[PDB]
Design a protein around this ligand. Structure first.
Ligand SMILES: CC(=O)N[C@@H]1[C@@H](O)[C@H](O[C@@H]2O[C@H](CO[C@H]3O[C@H](CO)[C@@H](O)[C@H](O)[C@@H]3O[C@@H]3O[C@H](CO)[C@@H](O[C@@H]4O[C@H](CO)[C@H](O)[C@H](O)[C@H]4O)[C@H](O)[C@H]3NC(C)=O)[C@@H](O)[C@H](O[C@H]3O[C@H](CO)[C@@H](O)[C@H](O)[C@@H]3O[C@@H]3O[C@H](CO)[C@@H](O[C@@H]4O[C@H](CO)[C@H](O)[C@H](O)[C@H]4O)[C@H](O)[C@H]3NC(C)=O)[C@@H]2O)[C@@H](CO)O[C@H]1O
Lengths: 134, 134
């Protein structure tokens, strides 16, 4: 990943992840990956401003052994190019719970059945300024 | 013990790296390694509480191709076992500056003449709570 890569995390259920970054003034999409490794992701958080045929929509997906899963699209989109953004991801057993800047909160099933998150990578037109564990 | 291993950081001169975390209640010692990789560190910040022939003394050192270098010690030790501490690290072509929790601030020569810091690694009796770029 050509963005931050944090490994050996050992994040456990009941633990929260807070990621604050800065959206590029000319963003077309950015992402946050989480899981065991780049090929086994419990969550691929991809807000596409305008990329891969999407406009102002969030695409969530999983990846099991390199194979992408069935996408889950969200319409809530409180993101603007050129601004500082903060998302928060809660790890639970059966699913994850994502909280956007506007207060919206949604879920993504823990399809892989992970009981600990070890990998995290940032990508796209977005630069991380703070990663906090809690 | 080994915690978060952050790769792909792109810390440039003048940019501040701020780490906040918790020291174990019975901490022998804890460390922070920054550099290009595990065998090429420009700063091995290692506050020793009671270990390696050291008591309440901060030990810093570089590490080129695995070979350690001349150690350097600091008598200032604002670390209380079992507490959330924080340090800041910025650099220039001649040396790094480490700011401790009580305002104390010292330097360590940039022996490797690094142009950017792409690696970070926590270790010891230290649980990282937050990593910020400023
Ligand atoms: C009387 C008295 O106590 N006087 C003290 C001195 O003892 C004291 O010196 C320190 O002593 C330490 C203990 O040495 C013994 O233990 C180690 C293992 O822990 C053994 O390896 C070593 O051989 C010693 O063994 C002991 O030998 C004696 C003699 O044989 C035995 O006693 C005899 O026993 C028989 C019965 O069998 C009989 O009774 C005899 O009468 C009796 O004499 C004893 O039993 C035996 N014990 C054991 C368990 O075997 C030393 O460890 C310490 O050494 C460090 O400091 C000196 C300088 O002060 C250095 O020269 C030395 O190389 C070493 O440096 C440290 O190296 C490490 C690793 O390289 C560094 O750590 C690394 O740092 C990196 C960052 O830079 C990374 O962080 C990395 O992770 C990390 O690992 C470390 O920073 C270095 N530190 C320094 C300062 O350089 C020292 O000699 C002194 C000082 O306290 O005070 C006197 O008053």
């Amino acid at each position: 990943a050509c963005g931050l890569v944090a490994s050996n995390l050992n994040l456990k259920p009941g633990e929260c992840l807070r990621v604050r970054g800065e959206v590029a003034a000319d963003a077309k999409s950015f992402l946050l990956n989480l899981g065991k490794d780049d090929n086994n992701l419990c969550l691929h958080f991809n807000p596409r401003f305008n990329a891969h045929g999407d406009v102002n929509t969030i695409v969530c997906n999983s990846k099991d052994a390199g194979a992408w899963g069935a996408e889950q699209r969200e319409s809530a989109f409180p993101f603007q190019p050129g601004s500082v953004v903060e998302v928060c991801i809660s790890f639970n057993q059966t699913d994850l719970t994502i909280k956007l800047p506007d207060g919206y909160e949604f879920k993504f099933p823990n399809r892989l059945n992970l009981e600990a998150i070890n990998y995290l990578s940032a990508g796209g037109d977005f630069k991380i300024k703070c990663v906090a564990f809690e």
